[PDB]
Amino acid sequence: TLPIVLSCNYQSDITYPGQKQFDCGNPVIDKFVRASLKKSVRNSDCAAKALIDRQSGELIGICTFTAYSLEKQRVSGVLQGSQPSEIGVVRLVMLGVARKYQKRGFDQDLLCDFFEHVKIIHQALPIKGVYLDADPAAINFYARLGFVQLSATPNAFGAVPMFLAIQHILAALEHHHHHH
Amino acid sequence: LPIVLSCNYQSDITYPGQKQFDCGNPVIDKFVRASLKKSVRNSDCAAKALIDRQSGELIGICTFTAYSLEKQRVSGVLQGSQPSEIGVVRLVMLGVARKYQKRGFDQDLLCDFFEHVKIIHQALPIKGVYLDADPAAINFYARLGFVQLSATPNAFGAVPMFLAIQHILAALEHHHHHH
């Protein structure tokens, strides 16, 4: 029973079917994948996780992330205990699922594949968690999978800051892995 | 004189003499004595270490963390179009015990750190390595490719320095294989 979708680290020299258009419902994310995805990871501005259909090769979802650091003030109330003045985290800057695959759980399949990559990152370089700026159409999604909202004020766009500590990401990962 | 073991500092291992660890820099000393062991358990940083293999004694320390800078600070050094917030790996502390100094162990640790930075870069792309260089170590880091961003050492008397990932990967690739 071969898997139907595959998780891949996106290669800048590869163009999947649907990548040149990739209608996902977020116009900002849409224009990024169509025109700017190849050059961002070539510069190593970010890393990308892709969801490819094994049969057709179509780009089901994308997920880009960078390294980032936050002051302890923006997280106080979430990171408990004594914490340093600067908090190193992995920032999730984009995660979109193509519209013709939405409402099917591929939203979360990409997040768990991203969580597994965060675990890899954590073993080479310690981080406190994952930070993101959630569009209002996606606050409930990240909140439904552990992320706690830090403020109700959107910065530069409707996006709001959300955070998920590394302890909860690891506990979610080994759960999934201990089951089967 | 000793067989050196390239180590990732683990907080469960007890290191003989770690509670004394004279290295010249007193700020870096007292961090190794009390804070570093708790620092990596709480995962406030990672630390690469060299261990005297015949005695288990800590020879050198090298702490680093995930960090980020603004495009302002690496202007004129990083070429091309760069995003708003830059992602780097920050070298926090690097000290060698005085008993082992003058033998080039500090450059050996920095090479292990660069080898680890390459591994980090293959999982989380970074733009280079940032650090605030003490004036005593400025000639040491500048000799290794690092460049001095500003001449203002307002942090604690240390000036900020940076070295792009392009040059680390090239420097680590500069060692051959005749197989």
mmCIF file of C-alpha atoms in Angstrom:
data_model
loop_
_atom_site.group_PDB
_atom_site.id
_atom_site.type_symbol
_atom_site.label_atom_id
_atom_site.label_comp_id
_atom_site.label_asym_id
_atom_site.label_seq_id
_atom_site.Cartn_x
_atom_site.Cartn_y
_atom_site.Cartn_z
ATOM 1 C CA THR A 1 0.000 0.000 0.000
ATOM 2 C CA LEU A 2 2.082 2.882 -1.328
ATOM 3 C CA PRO A 3 1.377 6.350 0.109
ATOM 4 C CA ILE A 4 -0.798 8.618 -1.998
ATOM 5 C CA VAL A 5 0.805 11.973 -1.124
ATOM 6 C CA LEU A 6 4.510 12.551 -0.521
ATOM 7 C CA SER A 7 6.396 15.039 1.641
ATOM 8 C CA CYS A 8 9.459 16.591 0.004
ATOM 9 C CA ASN A 9 11.924 19.357 0.726
ATOM 10 C CA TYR A 10 11.203 21.610 -2.235
ATOM 11 C CA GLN A 11 14.063 21.795 -4.739
ATOM 12 C CA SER A 12 14.500 25.153 -6.471
ATOM 13 C CA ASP A 13 15.260 23.466 -9.823
ATOM 14 C CA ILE A 14 11.950 21.541 -9.845
ATOM 15 C CA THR A 15 8.555 22.791 -11.056
ATOM 16 C CA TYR A 16 5.578 20.621 -10.118
ATOM 17 C CA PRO A 17 2.251 20.602 -11.982
ATOM 18 C CA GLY A 18 0.052 23.348 -10.583
ATOM 19 C CA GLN A 19 2.996 25.271 -9.114
ATOM 20 C CA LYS A 20 2.837 28.006 -11.779
ATOM 21 C CA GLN A 21 -0.748 28.830 -10.745
ATOM 22 C CA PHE A 22 -1.452 27.127 -7.371
ATOM 23 C CA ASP A 23 -4.844 28.553 -6.456
ATOM 24 C CA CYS A 24 -4.923 28.219 -2.657
ATOM 25 C CA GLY A 25 -7.269 31.029 -1.548
ATOM 26 C CA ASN A 26 -4.543 33.328 -0.179
ATOM 27 C CA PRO A 27 -3.556 35.772 -2.959
ATOM 28 C CA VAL A 28 -0.301 36.728 -1.210
ATOM 29 C CA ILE A 29 0.717 33.071 -0.879
ATOM 30 C CA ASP A 30 -0.523 32.492 -4.441
ATOM 31 C CA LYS A 31 1.771 35.089 -6.006
ATOM 32 C CA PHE A 32 4.706 33.920 -3.864
ATOM 33 C CA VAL A 33 4.656 30.310 -5.062
ATOM 34 C CA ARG A 34 4.013 31.240 -8.695
ATOM 35 C CA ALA A 35 6.755 33.852 -9.084
ATOM 36 C CA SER A 36 9.059 34.000 -6.040
ATOM 37 C CA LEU A 37 9.336 30.484 -4.581
ATOM 38 C CA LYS A 38 12.343 29.374 -6.645
ATOM 39 C CA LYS A 39 14.513 32.414 -5.926
ATOM 40 C CA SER A 40 13.722 32.603 -2.212
ATOM 41 C CA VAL A 41 15.159 29.176 -1.398
ATOM 42 C CA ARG A 42 17.977 29.691 -3.916
ATOM 43 C CA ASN A 43 19.040 32.720 -1.883
ATOM 44 C CA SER A 44 18.257 30.508 1.137
ATOM 45 C CA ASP A 45 15.788 33.127 2.338
ATOM 46 C CA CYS A 46 13.693 30.188 3.600
ATOM 47 C CA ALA A 47 13.205 26.442 3.423
ATOM 48 C CA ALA A 48 10.121 24.914 1.818
ATOM 49 C CA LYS A 49 8.129 21.749 2.497
ATOM 50 C CA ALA A 50 5.982 20.440 -0.355
ATOM 51 C CA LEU A 51 3.017 18.071 -0.575
ATOM 52 C CA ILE A 52 3.179 16.255 -3.918
ATOM 53 C CA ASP A 53 0.680 13.777 -5.335
ATOM 54 C CA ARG A 54 2.606 10.596 -6.107
ATOM 55 C CA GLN A 55 0.369 9.772 -9.078
ATOM 56 C CA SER A 56 -0.004 13.116 -10.871
ATOM 57 C CA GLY A 57 2.866 15.118 -9.354
ATOM 58 C CA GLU A 58 0.601 18.086 -8.589
ATOM 59 C CA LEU A 59 1.550 20.599 -5.897
ATOM 60 C CA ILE A 60 -1.019 20.012 -3.161
ATOM 61 C CA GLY A 61 0.467 22.254 -0.483
ATOM 62 C CA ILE A 62 3.477 24.398 0.330
ATOM 63 C CA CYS A 63 5.095 25.466 3.586
ATOM 64 C CA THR A 64 7.948 27.968 3.935
ATOM 65 C CA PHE A 65 9.849 28.794 7.109
ATOM 66 C CA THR A 66 12.922 30.732 8.258
ATOM 67 C CA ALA A 67 14.972 31.317 11.391
ATOM 68 C CA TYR A 68 13.724 34.029 13.718
ATOM 69 C CA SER A 69 14.252 35.516 17.167
ATOM 70 C CA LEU A 70 11.844 37.255 19.547
ATOM 71 C CA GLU A 71 12.168 39.255 22.740
ATOM 72 C CA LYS A 72 10.934 37.605 25.929
ATOM 73 C CA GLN A 73 8.212 40.256 26.305
ATOM 74 C CA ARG A 74 6.194 39.158 23.253
ATOM 75 C CA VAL A 75 5.915 35.634 24.706
ATOM 76 C CA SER A 76 5.613 36.238 28.487
ATOM 77 C CA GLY A 77 2.522 34.332 29.534
ATOM 78 C CA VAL A 78 3.378 31.399 27.227
ATOM 79 C CA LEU A 79 7.024 30.474 27.897
ATOM 80 C CA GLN A 80 7.023 29.703 31.606
ATOM 81 C CA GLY A 81 10.024 29.797 33.876
ATOM 82 C CA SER A 82 13.219 31.760 33.553
ATOM 83 C CA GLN A 83 13.897 32.633 29.911
ATOM 84 C CA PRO A 84 16.694 34.567 28.183
ATOM 85 C CA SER A 85 16.248 38.080 26.840
ATOM 86 C CA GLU A 86 16.316 36.769 23.249
ATOM 87 C CA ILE A 87 14.184 33.766 22.269
ATOM 88 C CA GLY A 88 15.250 31.777 19.209
ATOM 89 C CA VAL A 89 12.390 30.119 17.323
ATOM 90 C CA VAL A 90 11.488 28.796 13.888
ATOM 91 C CA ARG A 91 9.020 31.106 12.150
ATOM 92 C CA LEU A 92 6.288 29.644 9.949
ATOM 93 C CA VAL A 93 5.808 32.319 7.297
ATOM 94 C CA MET A 94 3.483 30.538 4.848
ATOM 95 C CA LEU A 95 1.385 27.394 4.612
ATOM 96 C CA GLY A 96 -1.205 27.018 1.877
ATOM 97 C CA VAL A 97 -3.160 24.089 0.465
ATOM 98 C CA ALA A 98 -4.410 24.272 -3.115
ATOM 99 C CA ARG A 99 -8.149 24.868 -3.209
ATOM 100 C CA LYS A 100 -9.057 21.669 -5.058
ATOM 101 C CA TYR A 101 -7.479 19.682 -2.189
ATOM 102 C CA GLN A 102 -8.831 21.739 0.722
ATOM 103 C CA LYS A 103 -11.344 20.443 3.285
ATOM 104 C CA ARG A 104 -9.505 17.105 3.238
ATOM 105 C CA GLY A 105 -6.961 17.265 6.079
ATOM 106 C CA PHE A 106 -3.945 18.168 3.938
ATOM 107 C CA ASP A 107 -3.835 21.360 6.017
ATOM 108 C CA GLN A 108 -2.679 19.279 9.002
ATOM 109 C CA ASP A 109 -0.636 16.694 7.078
ATOM 110 C CA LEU A 110 1.699 19.509 6.034
ATOM 111 C CA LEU A 111 1.867 20.818 9.601
ATOM 112 C CA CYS A 112 2.847 17.430 11.019
ATOM 113 C CA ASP A 113 5.470 17.056 8.290
ATOM 114 C CA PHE A 114 6.666 20.539 9.247
ATOM 115 C CA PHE A 115 6.683 19.555 12.927
ATOM 116 C CA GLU A 116 8.885 16.574 12.075
ATOM 117 C CA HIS A 117 11.293 18.934 10.317
ATOM 118 C CA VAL A 118 11.254 21.298 13.309
ATOM 119 C CA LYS A 119 12.338 18.343 15.450
ATOM 120 C CA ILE A 120 15.323 17.860 13.132
ATOM 121 C CA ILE A 121 16.135 21.564 13.421
ATOM 122 C CA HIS A 122 15.835 21.422 17.213
ATOM 123 C CA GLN A 123 18.458 18.684 17.569
ATOM 124 C CA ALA A 124 21.071 20.664 15.620
ATOM 125 C CA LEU A 125 20.059 24.096 16.952
ATOM 126 C CA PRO A 126 17.870 24.512 20.057
ATOM 127 C CA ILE A 127 14.745 26.613 19.608
ATOM 128 C CA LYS A 128 11.934 27.519 21.982
ATOM 129 C CA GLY A 129 9.071 26.856 19.569
ATOM 130 C CA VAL A 130 7.371 28.004 16.380
ATOM 131 C CA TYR A 131 6.126 31.545 15.753
ATOM 132 C CA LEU A 132 3.727 32.645 13.027
ATOM 133 C CA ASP A 133 1.498 35.522 11.934
ATOM 134 C CA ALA A 134 -1.879 33.953 11.171
ATOM 135 C CA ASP A 135 -4.310 35.343 8.626
ATOM 136 C CA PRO A 136 -7.828 35.662 10.128
ATOM 137 C CA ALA A 137 -9.001 32.885 7.791
ATOM 138 C CA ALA A 138 -6.497 30.557 9.505
ATOM 139 C CA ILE A 139 -6.406 31.545 13.205
ATOM 140 C CA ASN A 140 -8.772 28.727 14.166
ATOM 141 C CA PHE A 141 -6.627 26.196 12.288
ATOM 142 C CA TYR A 142 -3.356 26.881 14.120
ATOM 143 C CA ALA A 143 -5.261 27.385 17.381
ATOM 144 C CA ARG A 144 -6.880 23.977 16.877
ATOM 145 C CA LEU A 145 -3.419 22.356 16.783
ATOM 146 C CA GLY A 146 -1.787 23.952 19.840
ATOM 147 C CA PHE A 147 -0.904 27.516 18.853
ATOM 148 C CA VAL A 148 -1.856 30.182 21.406
ATOM 149 C CA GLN A 149 -2.593 33.693 20.171
ATOM 150 C CA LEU A 150 -0.349 36.379 21.657
ATOM 151 C CA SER A 151 -2.271 39.525 20.667
ATOM 152 C CA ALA A 152 -5.437 40.659 18.904
ATOM 153 C CA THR A 153 -3.606 43.411 16.963
ATOM 154 C CA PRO A 154 -2.639 42.569 13.336
ATOM 155 C CA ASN A 155 0.794 43.883 12.193
ATOM 156 C CA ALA A 156 1.108 45.066 8.502
ATOM 157 C CA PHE A 157 -1.860 42.741 7.648
ATOM 158 C CA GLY A 158 -4.770 41.018 9.478
ATOM 159 C CA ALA A 159 -2.144 38.476 10.642
ATOM 160 C CA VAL A 160 -1.897 38.021 14.450
ATOM 161 C CA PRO A 161 1.085 36.551 16.346
ATOM 162 C CA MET A 162 0.748 32.942 17.474
ATOM 163 C CA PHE A 163 3.195 30.684 19.300
ATOM 164 C CA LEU A 164 3.627 26.968 20.001
ATOM 165 C CA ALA A 165 6.342 25.857 22.418
ATOM 166 C CA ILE A 166 8.756 23.112 21.393
ATOM 167 C CA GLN A 167 7.700 20.864 24.289
ATOM 168 C CA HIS A 168 4.209 20.522 22.802
ATOM 169 C CA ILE A 169 5.561 19.864 19.298
ATOM 170 C CA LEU A 170 7.753 16.998 20.518
ATOM 171 C CA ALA A 171 4.929 15.498 22.596
ATOM 172 C CA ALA A 172 2.658 15.653 19.548
ATOM 173 C CA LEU A 173 5.323 13.961 17.422
ATOM 174 C CA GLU A 174 6.088 10.971 19.637
ATOM 175 C CA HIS A 175 2.346 10.379 20.187
ATOM 176 C CA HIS A 176 1.775 9.832 16.450
ATOM 177 C CA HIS A 177 4.893 7.681 16.272
ATOM 178 C CA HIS A 178 4.143 5.527 19.342
ATOM 179 C CA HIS A 179 0.648 4.689 18.057
ATOM 180 C CA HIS A 180 1.731 2.822 14.925
ATOM 181 C CA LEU B 1 49.771 16.830 24.664
ATOM 182 C CA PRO B 2 46.245 15.390 25.023
ATOM 183 C CA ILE B 3 43.928 13.285 22.788
ATOM 184 C CA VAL B 4 41.064 15.750 22.111
ATOM 185 C CA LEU B 5 37.485 14.576 21.799
ATOM 186 C CA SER B 6 35.126 16.696 19.699
ATOM 187 C CA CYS B 7 31.949 16.773 21.773
ATOM 188 C CA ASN B 8 28.424 18.114 21.877
ATOM 189 C CA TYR B 9 28.033 19.378 25.437
ATOM 190 C CA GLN B 10 25.477 17.204 27.229
ATOM 191 C CA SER B 11 24.114 18.319 30.600
ATOM 192 C CA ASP B 12 23.927 14.777 32.013
ATOM 193 C CA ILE B 13 27.706 14.246 31.864
ATOM 194 C CA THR B 14 29.820 15.528 34.744
ATOM 195 C CA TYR B 15 33.037 17.164 33.556
ATOM 196 C CA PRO B 16 35.995 17.082 35.979
ATOM 197 C CA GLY B 17 37.239 20.536 36.902
ATOM 198 C CA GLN B 18 34.351 22.272 35.127
ATOM 199 C CA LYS B 19 33.594 24.107 38.380
ATOM 200 C CA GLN B 20 37.012 25.817 38.132
ATOM 201 C CA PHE B 21 37.632 26.183 34.364
ATOM 202 C CA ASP B 22 40.045 29.103 34.207
ATOM 203 C CA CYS B 23 40.012 30.487 30.654
ATOM 204 C CA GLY B 24 41.085 34.124 31.060
ATOM 205 C CA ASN B 25 37.696 35.695 30.347
ATOM 206 C CA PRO B 26 35.896 35.820 33.721
ATOM 207 C CA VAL B 27 32.424 36.405 32.249
ATOM 208 C CA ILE B 28 32.803 33.258 30.145
ATOM 209 C CA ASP B 29 34.265 31.396 33.147
ATOM 210 C CA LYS B 30 31.388 31.821 35.610
ATOM 211 C CA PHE B 31 28.888 30.931 32.877
ATOM 212 C CA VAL B 32 30.564 27.541 32.410
ATOM 213 C CA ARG B 33 30.709 26.927 36.165
ATOM 214 C CA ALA B 34 27.033 27.325 37.021
ATOM 215 C CA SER B 35 24.822 28.367 34.111
ATOM 216 C CA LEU B 36 25.848 26.350 31.038
ATOM 217 C CA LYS B 37 24.729 22.961 32.378
ATOM 218 C CA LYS B 38 21.273 24.352 33.139
ATOM 219 C CA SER B 39 21.360 26.446 29.959
ATOM 220 C CA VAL B 40 21.411 23.433 27.630
ATOM 221 C CA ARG B 41 18.934 21.428 29.722
ATOM 222 C CA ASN B 42 16.493 24.331 29.382
ATOM 223 C CA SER B 43 17.804 24.482 25.778
ATOM 224 C CA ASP B 44 18.718 28.165 25.897
ATOM 225 C CA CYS B 45 21.687 27.327 23.624
ATOM 226 C CA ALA B 46 23.732 24.500 22.187
ATOM 227 C CA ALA B 47 27.382 24.020 23.083
ATOM 228 C CA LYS B 48 30.130 22.242 21.181
ATOM 229 C CA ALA B 49 33.017 21.154 23.380
ATOM 230 C CA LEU B 50 36.483 19.647 23.222
ATOM 231 C CA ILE B 51 37.194 17.081 25.934
ATOM 232 C CA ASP B 52 40.556 15.922 27.223
ATOM 233 C CA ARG B 53 40.007 12.246 26.438
ATOM 234 C CA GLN B 54 42.432 10.826 29.008
ATOM 235 C CA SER B 55 40.849 12.860 31.837
ATOM 236 C CA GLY B 56 37.363 13.929 30.695
ATOM 237 C CA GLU B 57 38.276 17.534 31.519
ATOM 238 C CA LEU B 58 36.650 20.285 29.477
ATOM 239 C CA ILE B 59 39.198 21.915 27.160
ATOM 240 C CA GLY B 60 37.122 24.423 25.199
ATOM 241 C CA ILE B 61 33.552 25.689 25.085
ATOM 242 C CA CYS B 62 31.584 27.144 22.169
ATOM 243 C CA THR B 63 27.983 28.238 22.773
ATOM 244 C CA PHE B 64 25.635 29.211 19.953
ATOM 245 C CA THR B 65 21.955 29.979 19.496
ATOM 246 C CA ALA B 66 19.289 30.730 16.920
ATOM 247 C CA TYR B 67 19.185 34.474 16.294
ATOM 248 C CA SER B 68 17.949 37.108 13.865
ATOM 249 C CA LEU B 69 19.148 40.546 12.797
ATOM 250 C CA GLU B 70 17.679 43.432 10.850
ATOM 251 C CA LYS B 71 18.696 44.232 7.282
ATOM 252 C CA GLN B 72 20.208 47.477 8.608
ATOM 253 C CA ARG B 73 23.021 45.772 10.503
ATOM 254 C CA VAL B 74 24.440 43.660 7.637
ATOM 255 C CA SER B 75 24.132 46.399 5.035
ATOM 256 C CA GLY B 76 27.178 46.692 2.799
ATOM 257 C CA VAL B 77 28.365 43.154 3.658
ATOM 258 C CA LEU B 78 25.588 40.902 2.361
ATOM 259 C CA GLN B 79 25.063 41.379 -1.363
ATOM 260 C CA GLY B 80 21.801 41.583 -3.267
ATOM 261 C CA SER B 81 18.196 41.796 -2.175
ATOM 262 C CA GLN B 82 17.714 40.657 1.421
ATOM 263 C CA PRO B 83 14.489 40.349 3.444
ATOM 264 C CA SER B 84 13.375 42.472 6.393
ATOM 265 C CA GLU B 85 14.655 40.259 9.227
ATOM 266 C CA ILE B 86 17.794 38.230 8.527
ATOM 267 C CA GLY B 87 18.276 34.759 9.990
ATOM 268 C CA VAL B 88 21.680 33.876 11.458
ATOM 269 C CA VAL B 89 23.422 31.612 13.959
ATOM 270 C CA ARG B 90 24.893 33.631 16.831
ATOM 271 C CA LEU B 91 28.156 32.518 18.432
ATOM 272 C CA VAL B 92 27.731 33.541 22.071
ATOM 273 C CA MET B 93 30.837 32.349 23.922
ATOM 274 C CA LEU B 94 34.066 30.574 22.982
ATOM 275 C CA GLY B 95 36.739 30.016 25.622
ATOM 276 C CA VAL B 96 39.659 27.620 25.988
ATOM 277 C CA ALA B 97 41.166 26.732 29.358
ATOM 278 C CA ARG B 98 44.456 28.483 30.102
ATOM 279 C CA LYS B 99 46.076 25.088 30.727
ATOM 280 C CA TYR B 100 45.419 24.304 27.051
ATOM 281 C CA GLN B 101 45.781 27.762 25.478
ATOM 282 C CA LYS B 102 48.455 28.834 22.961
ATOM 283 C CA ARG B 103 48.046 25.463 21.182
ATOM 284 C CA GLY B 104 45.481 26.464 18.547
ATOM 285 C CA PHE B 105 42.506 24.687 20.121
ATOM 286 C CA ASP B 106 40.288 27.758 19.675
ATOM 287 C CA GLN B 107 40.550 27.491 15.888
ATOM 288 C CA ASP B 108 39.886 23.742 16.083
ATOM 289 C CA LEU B 109 36.638 24.385 17.962
ATOM 290 C CA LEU B 110 35.624 27.104 15.502
ATOM 291 C CA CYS B 111 36.076 24.617 12.661
ATOM 292 C CA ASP B 112 33.848 22.111 14.466
ATOM 293 C CA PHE B 113 31.348 24.934 14.981
ATOM 294 C CA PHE B 114 31.470 25.761 11.266
ATOM 295 C CA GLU B 115 30.992 22.076 10.436
ATOM 296 C CA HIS B 116 27.915 22.150 12.660
ATOM 297 C CA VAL B 117 26.710 25.414 11.098
ATOM 298 C CA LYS B 118 26.772 23.659 7.722
ATOM 299 C CA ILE B 119 24.616 20.874 9.175
ATOM 300 C CA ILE B 120 22.209 23.474 10.573
ATOM 301 C CA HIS B 121 22.156 25.245 7.201
ATOM 302 C CA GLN B 122 21.026 22.037 5.467
ATOM 303 C CA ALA B 123 17.938 21.898 7.720
ATOM 304 C CA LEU B 124 17.269 25.595 8.429
ATOM 305 C CA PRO B 125 18.776 27.981 5.848
ATOM 306 C CA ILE B 126 20.784 30.784 7.440
ATOM 307 C CA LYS B 127 22.636 33.768 6.005
ATOM 308 C CA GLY B 128 25.799 33.439 8.083
ATOM 309 C CA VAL B 129 27.240 33.575 11.578
ATOM 310 C CA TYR B 130 26.930 36.626 13.824
ATOM 311 C CA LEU B 131 28.844 37.379 17.012
ATOM 312 C CA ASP B 132 29.912 40.301 19.191
ATOM 313 C CA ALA B 133 33.711 40.120 19.150
ATOM 314 C CA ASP B 134 35.649 41.222 22.212
ATOM 315 C CA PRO B 135 38.496 43.597 21.220
ATOM 316 C CA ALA B 136 41.028 40.971 22.312
ATOM 317 C CA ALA B 137 39.449 38.461 19.901
ATOM 318 C CA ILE B 138 38.767 40.885 17.025
ATOM 319 C CA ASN B 139 42.051 40.026 15.306
ATOM 320 C CA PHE B 140 41.196 36.344 15.802
ATOM 321 C CA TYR B 141 37.748 36.451 14.188
ATOM 322 C CA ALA B 142 38.683 38.921 11.437
ATOM 323 C CA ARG B 143 41.511 36.565 10.448
ATOM 324 C CA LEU B 144 38.970 33.739 10.004
ATOM 325 C CA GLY B 145 36.889 35.657 7.439
ATOM 326 C CA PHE B 146 34.575 37.572 9.771
ATOM 327 C CA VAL B 147 34.094 41.245 8.951
ATOM 328 C CA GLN B 148 33.394 44.091 11.368
ATOM 329 C CA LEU B 149 29.922 45.521 10.738
ATOM 330 C CA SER B 150 30.172 48.563 13.019
ATOM 331 C CA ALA B 151 32.879 50.176 15.129
ATOM 332 C CA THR B 152 30.453 50.848 17.999
ATOM 333 C CA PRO B 153 30.898 48.292 20.834
ATOM 334 C CA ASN B 154 27.842 49.431 22.792
ATOM 335 C CA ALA B 155 26.800 45.859 23.696
ATOM 336 C CA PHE B 156 29.351 45.262 26.470
ATOM 337 C CA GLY B 157 32.479 46.635 24.814
ATOM 338 C CA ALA B 158 32.329 44.050 22.011
ATOM 339 C CA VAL B 159 31.844 45.033 18.367
ATOM 340 C CA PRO B 160 29.452 43.033 16.154
ATOM 341 C CA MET B 161 30.957 40.812 13.470
ATOM 342 C CA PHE B 162 29.492 38.667 10.715
ATOM 343 C CA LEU B 163 30.562 36.019 8.221
ATOM 344 C CA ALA B 164 28.251 34.985 5.383
ATOM 345 C CA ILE B 165 27.280 31.327 4.993
ATOM 346 C CA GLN B 166 28.661 31.449 1.442
ATOM 347 C CA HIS B 167 32.195 31.708 2.821
ATOM 348 C CA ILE B 168 31.779 29.049 5.525
ATOM 349 C CA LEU B 169 30.627 26.511 2.923
ATOM 350 C CA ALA B 170 33.534 27.488 0.666
ATOM 351 C CA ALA B 171 36.047 27.328 3.529
ATOM 352 C CA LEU B 172 34.806 23.889 4.603
ATOM 353 C CA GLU B 173 34.813 22.685 0.982
ATOM 354 C CA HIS B 174 38.465 23.777 0.603
ATOM 355 C CA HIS B 175 39.647 20.429 2.066
ATOM 356 C CA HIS B 176 40.213 17.716 -0.499
ATOM 357 C CA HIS B 177 40.031 13.940 -1.024
ATOM 358 C CA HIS B 178 42.497 11.934 -3.141
ATOM 359 C CA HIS B 179 40.504 8.684 -3.270
#
